[PDB]
């Protein structure tokens, strides 16, 4: 009875940025699930395609835990069929996404007085992302007709932009840690206590 290391991804000391989201393949274990849903410390717990209670008695071929950090007003973009700077250039969920989107406020951790500018997010990109695509390219983006010879300037902007996280920010502009569980469904390797 080896439970899945959900404490290693949810409580993770340092979280990766949304443009370079961290995926941890979870396999060969039993998912408690009910322990995560019982905790009231999460501000958003939306599931798609599968009921959270039925997952406690079901099995899947593989599960993936995608963890990153965004802002409050951007959590609504972590959902199937969403548009925005996060859903198009950073983390795109499929229109047939089968899983759960979990998010909670982390203003007392990732925010520092004077500003914590270590979390980044892609601001420019010539085409929207594919579902579950990950872009870490630091290539200078060409906005206008002028060629961009790898030097920043007018219509020559660095694609990544830093977040401004201060404890004095509004409730909708604070750092929120998001964990997305993708249920890839071959023999099943992750089951619930029911089975």
């Amino acid at each position, epitope marked *: 009875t080896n439970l899945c290391p959900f404490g290693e991804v949810f409580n993770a000391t340092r979280f990766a940025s949304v443009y370079a989201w961290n995926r941890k393949r979870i396999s060969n274990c039993v998912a408690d699930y009910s322990v995560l849903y019982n905790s009231a410390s999460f501000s958003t717990f939306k599931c798609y395609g599968v009921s959270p209670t039925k997952l406690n008695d079901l099995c899947f071929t593989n599960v993936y835990a995608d963890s990153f950090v965004i802002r409050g007003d951007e959590v609504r973009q972590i959902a199937p069929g969403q548009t925005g700077k996060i859903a198009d250039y950073n983390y795109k969920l499929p229109d047939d996404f089968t899983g759960c989107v979990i998010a909670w406020n982390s203003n007392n951790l990732d925010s520092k007085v004077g500003g914590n500018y270590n979390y980044l997010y892609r601001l420019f990109r010539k085409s929207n992302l594919k579902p579950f695509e990950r872009d870490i390219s630091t290539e200078i983006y060409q*906005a206008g*007709s*002028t060629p961009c010879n790898g030097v920043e300037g007018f*219509n020559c*902007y*660095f694609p990544l*932009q830093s977040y*401004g996280f201060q404890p004095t920010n509004g409730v909708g502009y604070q750092p929120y840690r998001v964990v997305v569980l993708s249920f890839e469904l071959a023999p099943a390797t992750v089951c619930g206590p029911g089975s």
Partner: antibody
Amino acid sequence: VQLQQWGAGLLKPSETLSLTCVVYGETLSGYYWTWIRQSPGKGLEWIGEISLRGTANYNPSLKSRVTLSVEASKNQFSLKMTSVTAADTAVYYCVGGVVLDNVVWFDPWGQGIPVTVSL
Amino acid sequence: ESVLTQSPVSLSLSPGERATLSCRASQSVGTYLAWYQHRPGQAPRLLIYNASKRATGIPARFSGSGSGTDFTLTISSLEPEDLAVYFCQQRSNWLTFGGGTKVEIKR
């Protein structure tokens, strides 16, 4: 989203222009904040833009006299001009540069503060 | 540098009529055009961006069209609050603001 603005309105033809502009209800993240001015009947002239990371783009005409700045702590950014002549008398707007479909436009315009330059 | 010209310079149209403002470009720009509205005693706003996309909170009367060098801004129904000066801008290589067209209301 609103923009507050400070700055002196009367300078000598040999002093230094100084204008600050603070942003409220919005972090200065995904924006390229710029200064745009318009002398009476002259037409709009793009002074220069700056971001949170400090990258600065300037107009080739006044690139020598303009020294922008940015204070991410107070959510403010300033504009300083050296040796302001009488031709610099204009209404100075502090404008935010949105990123709409990979094209940087100017959605949050400001009211503006005129700077009369005379002895 | 590309220059922007607007036709006409002043428009006198009664409320309820359709005003079509043109902004011609000296060089090829494509869809890198935008229309701004400057109320008489207020700060300017962004009405149309990318030559056809209506900005947030802008009434449906304002509609942009055109691509390449000839763009048209069409106000479907002039309302008494639409009395302002409208100017265009391009971002194809360098920022060049248009001359501007004044919209006058007849009564």
